[PDB]
Design a protein around this nucleic acid. Structure first.
Ligand SMILES: [Mg+2]
Ligand SMILES: [Mg+2]
Ligand SMILES: [Mg+2]
Lengths: 165, 170, 258, 153, 129
RNA sequence: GCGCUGCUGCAGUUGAAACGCCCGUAGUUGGCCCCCCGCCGCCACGAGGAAACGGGAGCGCUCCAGGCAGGCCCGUUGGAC
């Protein structure tokens, strides 16, 4: 129940000539441009991912003022086992904190595959992570690395920086 | 109706149990007065059971059972008092008894290291439990029941036959 | 194994809090059975010879007692080894000295001088309720006293007020959170404080958490917690309000006294 | 070659960092899913199945596509064998050694190899008996090995 | 077989420093190694390091700047009473002025000075100076 | 003394000392990973339970080995821990 969903859904209906989204979150960057995330339901992520690049481009052209990102919504449980007193319940490994963050990272920029991750530990600076991307693509995603870092920090408290190799 | 069905199974047992002529004497539960079984109506309770306490629960088998055991803690005339411990089953060849293995650790100061030790402890197993080797049992202290027995089982978790033996302090 | 009970008591084996000199001799007084036990009592002779100093030897105590010069709970006693315990009444009319036996902070016996207004009663702890002959209810106390037909409202661990002349209950203070208590066992003997919490472990002891008047907190088991009133002591107590000082303060006080 | 020998080489395979499929992939997991059945229906071991898929169908890794391994698929389809393949091949080698030995009984290297193979078989069988992948009653015996080979194959 | 990753890492680091190199590689990337290196970095012995992911026991790279003389582990983790630390200090380190002994406690990985301040003890991991 | 019994903390090519080799059960030892749930060990605090001895606060038996005394206007004199 927000204004943005209404016009983005209007655009959605204006694309084809079935699939619905859960919610939307926008976050600003250092520049006046913001980035909007779409919390897609988990099962329909792959169906949205067949040609997500086209959808994001058409949405950007339809409604400017901020970039459109599409991601799934995953839950996190905070206990490996559960002691009901009678039987012990195992938490599946897919619901851990670490798996969700990595999947989020891969989803933020699915069309361009990540070729490596590295975390650096400076002497005093808060430890930070730098990823590695192909040189085949750069100017395609060079202009939108700051937004990627900002959204990663927003969703995950962990920070990051982007490079190419 | 449930009560009527239960009494027949209880009432019926005391019959052929009497026809089991091999037994030297008629085994009976002391609390009950023999004669109630002649009452055609379910006007009196045919079986006796108590609550152990300490947060434990009386198994349904004892309540819906048909056996006689003076040394059982639920249907007998013995009480649980003192220390409650845990262990694993080592042997179960005896009639109504088992051997429980207990694991602990001993510290040697000179070498600043530990040793693994074990002890054998005998317990009385009521007919209300089914136990095999390697299961985990909880035993409660009671008065001397024999030369080497001062404990009775009150709980038992199950285990699988295939399971590499693991040193398990409890 | 001794074939019978024990009638002696080596001085080196005596309780620490009696404060008996190592070189006094091989032997020490052996208390006789009575209101209080061996480790929760003190003989009369020790009070009358090693403290008040009204006697110099065993013989003088013998003469003083057999002349009936001391009253205990309103009753003259003539046994030098009679055991004196907690919350008892000590009277010597010849010199008009009235004392109630309580505990100091350091964990030793003391005499609290009192008045005539409150020497007609004593406080006792109830720790056993049972059915006697014919089924008639009874109760018992820390001083080996039995009362028939108590009020149903009275339960165990409570505290009872009884007149010295007549063993008739006047009032009873319940055992509840928010009540002043006096510790009477172990490391914290003599400390005064108010209850804060009660935690019970099935089949074992029950632990009590109290806070001193100055905010100090301490623990002990329920077997040595005594109630002395509702938020305020019913009886007169020593000069200090049950405050155990630290080693530094005690050393300072000793230096001042020297 | 370490557990029962002295050598120590390091010939292995290094799978890629990225789990995604190829950009020329044109198969949904269903196509691979039924293909496995057809090869399974012909009595093909999983390893040969993987080699066939990789060579003819140009699928380097099945897990990257269907999200699951081959044996898991077979079990879900109720076609997985009762004896794991490695133990079965171990038993085959033991049987072949035993037959060659019954033919002539002056060769000692063969006895040495047989001892080693039986030791390995016993270890692996114990491990599989644990984890409840085999019945507890399962037991390997020299004299009726071929029967358990053929009947369970 | 490989057992104590920390020992191999420390031995490699010391060997590299002995010939005055600047960068090293260490196959294991355990958390305990990470905390050990963090303490070293904060105290000023090794400066910077990075962890290189690969899905198969990530690798780690560290930089050297001299200074460090020795660093080792204690293979069986003893139990150190809060009040029984001076004996180990005297037995292991060259002087009471400098040096750091690593203990793992219920409060996390810390140095013997910090634990002495909090009057608590635990298990010993290693040392360096 | 003795690091000549070596847990801290010995030696094992030539001084005394690596089984001829392999398999293998008890036994000992076991890579990495899940941020909070239960259990074992572990650390800290606490209760409870004898003194003497030992440590230790104070007191000039002429000092001391000792003892728990002693002064006047003594913490309720003290004998704490
Ligand atoms: Mg081997
Ligand atoms: Mg190798
Ligand atoms: Mg030689």
């Amino acid at each position: 129940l927000s204004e943005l969903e209404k016009q983005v859904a209007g655009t959605l209906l204006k694309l084809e000539d079935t699939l619905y989204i859960s919610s939307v979150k926008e976050i600003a960057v250092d520049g006046d441009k913001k980035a909007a995330v779409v919390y897609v339901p988990y099962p329909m992520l792959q169906s949205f991912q067949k040609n997500s690049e086209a959808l994001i481009l058409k949405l950007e052209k339809n409604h400017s003022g901020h970039r459109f990102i599409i991601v799934a919504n995953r839950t996190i449980m905070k206990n490996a086992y559960v002691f009901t007193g009678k039987k012990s319940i195992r938490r599946p490994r897919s619901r851990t904190m670490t798996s969700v963050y990595n999947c989020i990272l891969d989803d933020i920029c699915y069309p361009i595959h990540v070729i490596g991750k590295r975390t650096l530990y400076p002497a005093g600076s808060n430890p930070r992570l730098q990823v590695v991307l192909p040189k085949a693509v750069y100017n395609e995603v060079s202009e939108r690395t700051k937004t990627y870092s900002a959204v990663y920090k927003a969703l995950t408290e962990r920070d990051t920086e982007f490079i190419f190799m | 109706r449930r009560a009527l069905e239960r009494a027949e199974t209880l009432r019926k047992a005391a019959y052929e149990m009497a026809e089991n002529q091999h037994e030297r004497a008629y085994h009976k539960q002391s609390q009950i007065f023999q004669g109630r079984f002649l009452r055609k109506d379910n006007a009196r309770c045919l079986r006796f059971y108590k609550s152990i306490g300490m947060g434990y629960h009386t198994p349904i088998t004892a309540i819906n059972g048909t056996y006689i055991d003076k040394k059982c803690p639920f249907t007998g005339n013995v009480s649980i008092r003192g220390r409650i411990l845990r262990g694993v089953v080592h042997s179960a060849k005896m009639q109504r008894s088992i051997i429980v293995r207990r694991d602990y650790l001993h510290f040697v100061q000179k070498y600043k290291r530990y040793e693994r030790r074990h002890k054998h402890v005998a317990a009385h197993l009521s007919p209300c439990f089914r136990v095999k080797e390697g299961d985990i049992v909880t035993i409660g202290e009671c008065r001397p029941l024999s030369k080497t027995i001062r404990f009775n089982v009150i709980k038992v978790e199950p285990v699988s036959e295939a399971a590499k033996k693991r040193f398990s302090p409890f | 194994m001794a074939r019978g009970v024990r009638k002696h008591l080596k001085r080196l084996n005596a309780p620490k809090h009696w404060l008996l000199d190592k070189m006094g001799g091989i032997w020490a007084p052996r208390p006789t059975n009575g209101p209080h036990g061996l480790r929760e009592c003190i003989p009369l002779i020790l009070i009358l010879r090693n403290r008040l100093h009204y006697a110099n030897t065993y013989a003088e105590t013998s003469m003083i007692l057999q002349d009936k010069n001391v009253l205990i709970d309103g009753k003259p006693r003539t046994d030098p080894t009679f055991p004196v315990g907690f919350m008892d009444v000590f009277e010597i009319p010849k010199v008009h000295k009235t004392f109630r036996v309580l505990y100091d902070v350091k964990g030793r016996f003391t005499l609290v001088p009192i008045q005539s207004n409150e020497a007609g009663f004593k406080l006792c702890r109830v720790q056993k309720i049972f059915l006697g002959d014919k089924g008639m209810p009874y109760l018992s106390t820390h001083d080996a006293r039995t009362i028939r037909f108590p009020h149903p409202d009275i339960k165990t661990n409570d505290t009872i007020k009884i007149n010295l002349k007549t063993g008739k209950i006047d009032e009873w203070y319940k055992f509840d959170i928010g009540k002043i208590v006096m510790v009477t066992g172990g490391r914290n003997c003599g400390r005064i404080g108010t209850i804060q919490a009660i935690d019970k472990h099935m089949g074992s002891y029950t632990m009590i958490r109290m806070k001193d008047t100055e905010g100090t907190e301490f623990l002990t088991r329920l077997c040595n917690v005594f109630v002395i009133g509702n938020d305020s002591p019913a009886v007169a107590i020593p000069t200090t309000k049950g405050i155990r000082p630290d080693i530094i303060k005690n050393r300072e006080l000793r230096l001042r006294s020297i | 070659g370490r557990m029962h020998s002295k050598g120590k080489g390091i010939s292995r395979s290094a799978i890629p960092y990225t789990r995604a499929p190829a950009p020329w992939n044109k198969y949904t997991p269903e196509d691979v899913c039924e293909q496995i059945c057809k090869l399974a229906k012909k009595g093909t071991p999983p390893s040969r199945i993987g080699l066939i898929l990789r060579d003819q169908f140009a699928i380097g890794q099945v897990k990257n596509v269907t999200g699951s391994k081959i044996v898991r698929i077979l079990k879900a389809k109720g076609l997985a064998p009762e004896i794991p393949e490695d133990l079965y091949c171990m038993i085959k080698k033991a049987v072949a050694i035993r037959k060659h030995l019954e033919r002539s009984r002056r060769d000692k290297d063969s006895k040495f190899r047989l001892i080693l193979v039986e030791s390995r078989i016993h270890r692996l069988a114990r491990y599989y008996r644990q984890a409840r992948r085999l019945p507890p009653t399962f037991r390997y015996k020299s004299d009726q090995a071929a029967a358990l080979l053929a009947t369970y194959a | 077989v490989r057992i104590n990753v920390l020992r191999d890492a420390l031995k490699s680091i010391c060997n590299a420093q002995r010939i005055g190199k600047k960068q090293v590689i260490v196959r294991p990337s355990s958390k305990v190694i990470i905390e050990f290196l963090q303490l070293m970095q904060k105290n000023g012995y090794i400066s910077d390091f990075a962890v290189v992911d690969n899905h198969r026991s990530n690798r780690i790279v560290v930089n050297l700047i001299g200074r460090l003389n020795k660093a080792g582990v204690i293979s069986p983790r003893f139990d150190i009473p809060a009040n029984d630390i001076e004996k180990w200090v005297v037995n292991l380190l060259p002087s009471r002025l400098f040096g750091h002994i690593i203990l793992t406690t219920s409060q996390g990985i810390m140095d013997h000075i910090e634990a002495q301040h909090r009057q608590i003890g635990g298990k010993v991991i290693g040392y360096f100076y």
